[PDB]
Structure 1
Amino acid sequence: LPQTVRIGTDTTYAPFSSKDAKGEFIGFDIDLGNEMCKRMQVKCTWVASDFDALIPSLKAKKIDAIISALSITDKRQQEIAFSDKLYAADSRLIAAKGSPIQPTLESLKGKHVGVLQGSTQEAYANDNWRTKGVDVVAYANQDLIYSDLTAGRLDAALQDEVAASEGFLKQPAGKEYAFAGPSVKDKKYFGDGTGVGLRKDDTELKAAFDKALTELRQDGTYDKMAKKYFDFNVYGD
């Protein structure tokens, strides 16, 4: 393995990856990433990036790994490799409480919908909704989405369910918002949970993350770390 593993994360997706008041990285990805590094007996440099720059950065070797609620998708498996699943991640719409909005083309035609640049939600939204005349708006970071949502510049936003809920709906910014309809299940766009994104040729590094991850799951470090943030089964199936 490298002496120092450089891990890219988008620090705008609480409670997975965000900054505290003094600019330190916090959230479940950071705790997963630090624990794994600990067991791998390597050093880990955290690197902040816009989400859409992480895969490009990994391919260019500016970073060695991505831990950024990165969904394991068939599209992304063409370009990069992944650890074993870190946690599940479903997609779900939010709008102003008592919006009639549903994640359907019929509900959203006319409306302004925020999605993260580079995300699965952007892929789903662009193909299903933007083509069909929904005003789908793509943002550098999820904080700009929540801000344009509370500004009234966006009718709704699509992102990871658990990010919206712990990161927005249950924080002071989101008290006037709710989920708009149920989660959107779609195998092709949304992938099979999140993992560490790695260069396809880094077989050793993948082997090292996968070994650390099973180890922390066998001894209950995982549920202990998860209970900090979640009162449910974040790992999923």
Structure 2
Amino acid sequence: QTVRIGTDTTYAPFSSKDAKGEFIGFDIDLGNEMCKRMQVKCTWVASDFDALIPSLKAKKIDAIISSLAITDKRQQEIAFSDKLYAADSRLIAAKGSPIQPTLESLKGKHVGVLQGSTQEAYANDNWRTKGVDVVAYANQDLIYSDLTAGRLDAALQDEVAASEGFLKQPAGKEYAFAGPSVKDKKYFGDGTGVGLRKDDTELKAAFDKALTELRQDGTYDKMAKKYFDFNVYGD
């Protein structure tokens, strides 16, 4: 039909808006390229990240492309395409900060996470319970803003989003990663994928076919090179 694809546009370089409100980023490029090969029209629909799976279940959108990690919990509720790219999580803080992604370091500190994210799940279970002030936000822009305002000591999000979308931008010049990637298979998933209703077998097959084809002919790498000088796909 027309495939309606939901995304949250506060996660550069994967999904954001340009100065005239056009959606831009690697998620947008992947979605548009897949749609072309599937020979379908696609309409992008912006929403808060935590609204994406509910909107999909409610049939207000037909697909999610929004750095949506493929997790065990989410697969109980929806289906996923094959992996679009890998996504590790990592903390950021002010440059020179001693902060580490540990309870010892973070107890009593204010740590921002995106509401509805794997980072929120991780932080709520491991940090909020034990006395870290975990603050959950409607979108990632509010997090970066509250961090630069000094209201947050740190923020947890996807590593590549933080790096390319903030640290390497003027806004994040005085900030840096605090500690290494936070690796936990119980939480952050096995890369990201197109989120789909479980019964939409045909639509999943179509996305999967287009994805294989655009990876195979080198289009994936061509598009990825616009944003990344490393292997974003992973293994």
In structure 1, what is the Cα distance between the partners aligned to 2:49 and 2:215? Answer: 27
Measured against aligned partners, the alpha-carbon deviations of 1:101-154 in whole angstroms (never above 9, x if no partner) come to 000000000100000000000000000000000000000000000000000000
Q: Secondary structure at the match of 1:188?
A: coil
For 2:76 and 2:190, locate their aligned partners in 1 and report how far apart those are by CA, in whole Å: 15
How far, CA to CA, are the matches of 2:198 and 2:186 in structure 1?
A: 21
1:23-80 per-position Cα deviation (integer Å, ceiling 9, x unaligned): 0000000000000000000000000000000000000000000000000000000000
CA distance in 2, matches of 1:191, 1:110: 28
Hey, what's the Cα distance between the residues in 2 that align with 1:109 and 1:234?
A: 32
> Distance between the aligned counterparts of 1:35 and 1:185, measured in 2?
31
Deviation of the 1:84 alpha carbon: 0.1
CA distance in 1, matches of 2:166, 2:104: 26
Which residue of 30, 33, 36 maps to 1:32?
30
TM-score (norm 1): 0.99
In structure 2, stretches of 5+ residues that fail to align are none
Secondary structure at 2:141 match in 1? helix
Q: For 1:110 and 1:127, locate their aligned partners in 2 and report how far apart those are by CA, in whole Å.
A: 15
SS of 2:150's partner is coil
Q: Alpha-carbon deviation of 1:207?
A: 0.2
How far apart are the structure 1 equivalents of 2:94 and 2:182?
A: 18
SS in 2 for 1:210: helix
CA deviations 1:66-102 (Å, max 9, x no partner) are: 0000000000000000000000000000000010000
- Structure 1 SS opposite 2:206: helix
Name the CA distance, whole Å, in 1 between partners of 2:63 and 2:113: 24
Unaligned runs of 5+ in 1: none
- Report the alpha carbon displacement of residue 188 of structure 1 after superposing the two structures with TM: 1.1
How far apart in 2 are the matches of 1:185 and 1:100? 19
Q: Deviations over 1:144-168 (max 9, x none)?
A: 0000000000000000000000000
1:123 & 1:99 partners in 2: Cα distance? 24
Q: 1:184 & 1:230 partners in 2: Cα distance?
A: 21
Q: Take 1:130 and 1:185, find their aligned partners in 2: how far apart are those partners? A: 18
Alpha-carbon separation, structure 1, partners of 2:103 and 2:76: 29
1:204 Cα deviation from its structure 2 partner: 0.2
Q: Distance in 1 between matches of 2:124 and 2:218?
A: 40
Paired with 1:27 and 1:21, the residues of 2 have a C-alpha distance of 13
Paired residue secondary structure (1:131): helix
What does 1:216-231 align with in structure 2 at a 5 Å threshold?
A: 216-231=214-229
The count of residues paired between Structure 1 and Structure 2 equals 235
In the alignment, the residues of structure 1 paired with residue 19 and residue 72 of structure 2 have an alpha-carbon distance, to the nearest angstrom, of: 37
CA separation in 2, counterparts of 1:228 and 1:146?
Answer: 23
Task: Report Cα offsets for 1:168-199 as digits up to 9, x if no partner.
Answer: 00001000100000001101100000000000
- Counterpart Cα distance in 2 of 1:51 and 1:162: 17
Work out the percentage of aligned pairs sharing the same amino acid: 99
